[PDB]
Design a protein around this nucleic acid. Structure first.
Length: 487
DNA sequence: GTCCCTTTATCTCTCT
DNA sequence: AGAGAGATAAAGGGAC
């Protein structure tokens, strides 16, 4: 019964004004549901046209959530009242709106941002942070409710209260800190800093509780220190991570060899449980079928989704090496980040049309993949490389440089965006723009430079454009912001 | 379906 | 280049 309505709406939504594609409408259907896709079909015009002007990807972002219809409805209602009335940018709104029950988060933002700023001294960016989640309305109401007692009875700072509330089930973590802080500190000598670190993670309640019940056991019985424990607790799925460490402590330090430290290191990211289990399974495989060492595997595993990385190393190692002519060290390198599954996969399916259909080396490609988000890097190269070499006069080595960093996608995009405005309007050369973009944070660096030239902050008008450039190159937005307070 | 929560995976910026 | 920390995205389960 679901397929009928999806096929009915689908290649009518694939046309104007949305131009959506398979994967896109797939994402909507399997999270916002058929209602979401129908609502997108219906209000397709009101969403892209003024005064909303929503980009397609932004629409997709609002719909693909339990409630997407309501989220669209409410965005169309209060997209200008929030901007108009609370100086919010439309992107901030779109960010509040793109979670389960965005309609509540939006309505509650409208209703509470004033008091939360005036009565409790939040900045709009803090309020938007609290609301930008699943059960945002709840987090907001619980900040408004609890912030005075947490600050006054428990000695936390407003910032800490915001950190706790800025995740999944923020309310649960706030109330759990309210309940458990004077026990975690009293009877275990933790600090408010530590209790906040534990709670400032999705499922934070379960993390705090699990710490109260398993710290004495992991520590005073499995030979761990409170520091190692809190370390494990201070990521998402910290309860699962803690319990899994407690089970597998003696089932990995005497079997596979792994040491306590290695265990806690693999347990100290998102899905630490998964990564630990996958390590228990795959460590003897990859070391005696792929030739790898313990150290390498533990590296691949000591990341977020480390499980996915382990399993994709298993799956893709020989084929990438023996066909695509990569080496083990290289592959371990590409995998040793957050998203190495996506990295390895994207290398596998793209190394062809970059080496062949362009002229990239596998080493260049490997360097593009060896940086967190590598997938996005590579894909954005594959799109924007003809654009950037035919219509802007860049050499491939330059594009490869720009993508050879975290935020590569962002870097390259922001290059094509502001490639003539700074070169034509302000007199920068291409090599300058590339030079700026070729670091971590190229996108915000380029953005602050354009934001400088097109309206000189006098403290920085005191420098020649070139100095500005070399400055943006050596430290980006942070350094360009730092060399203004010094005056 | 719509809202809230928890767990898990991915991406981007800053800091040296 | 690594680590830390934020942010965004995906998947699933309880509740009504």
């Amino acid at each position: 019964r679901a397929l009928e309505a999806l096929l009915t709406v689908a290649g009518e939504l694939r046309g104007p004004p949305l131009q959506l594609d398979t994967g896109q409408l797939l994402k909507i259907a399997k999270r916002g549901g058929v209602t979401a896709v129908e609502a997108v079909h219906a209000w397709r015009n009101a969403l892209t046209g003024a005064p909303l002007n929503l980009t397609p990807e932004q629409v997709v972002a609002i719909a693909s959530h339990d409630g997407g219809k309501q989220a669209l409805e409410t965005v169309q209602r209060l997209l200008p009242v929030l901007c108009q009335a609370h100086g919010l940018t439309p992107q901030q709104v779109v960010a509040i709106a793109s979670h389960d029950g965005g309609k509540q988060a939006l309505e509650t933002v409208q209703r509470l941002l004033p008091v939360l700023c005036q009565a409790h001294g939040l900045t709009p960016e803090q309020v938007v942070a609290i609301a930008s989640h699943d059960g945002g309305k709840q987090a907001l109401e619980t900040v408004q409710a609890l912030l005075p007692v947490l600050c006054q009875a428990h000695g936390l700072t407003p910032e800490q209260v915001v950190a706790i509330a800025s995740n999944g089930g923020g309310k649960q973590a706030l109330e759990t800190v309210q309940r458990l802080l004077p026990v975690l500190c009293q009877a275990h000598g933790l600090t408010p800093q530590q209790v906040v670190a534990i709670a400032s993670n999705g499922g934070g309640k379960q993390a705090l509780e699990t710490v109260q019940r398993l710290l004495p056991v992991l520590c005073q019985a499995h030979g761990l220190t409170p520091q190692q424990v809190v370390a494990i607790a201070s990521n998402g799925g910290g309860k699962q991570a803690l319990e899994t460490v407690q089970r597998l402590l003696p089932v990995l330090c005497q079997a596979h060899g792994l040491t306590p430290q290695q265990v806690v290191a693999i347990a100290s990211n998102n899905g630490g449980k998964q990564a630990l289990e996958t390590v228990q399974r795959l460590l003897p495989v990859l070391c005696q079928a792929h030739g790898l060492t313990p150290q390498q595997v533990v590296a691949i595993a000591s990341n977020g989704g480390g499980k996915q990385a382990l399993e994709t190393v298993q799956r893709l190692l020989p084929v990438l090496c023996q066909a695509h002519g990569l080496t083990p060290q290289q592959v371990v390198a590409i995998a040793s980040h957050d998203g190495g599954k996506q990295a390895l996969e994207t290398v596998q399916r793209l190394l062809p049309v970059l080496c062949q259909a362009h002229g990239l080396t596998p080493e260049q490609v490997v360097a593009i993949a060896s940086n967190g988000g590598g997938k996005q890097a590579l894909e954005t190269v594959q799109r924007l490389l003809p654009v950037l070499c035919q219509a802007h006069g860049l050499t491939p080595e330059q594009v490869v440089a720009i993508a050879s960093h975290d935020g590569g996608k962002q870097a390259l995009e922001t290059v094509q965006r502001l490639l003539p405005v700074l070169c034509q309007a302000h007199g920068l050369t291409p090599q300058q723009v590339v030079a700026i973009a070729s670091n971590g944070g190229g996108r915000p660096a380029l953005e602050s430079i354009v934001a400088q030239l097109s309206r000189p902050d006098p403290a920085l008008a005191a420098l020649t454009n070139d100095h500005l450039v070399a400055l943006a190159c050596l430290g980006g937005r942070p350094a360009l912001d730092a060399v203004k307070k010094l005056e």
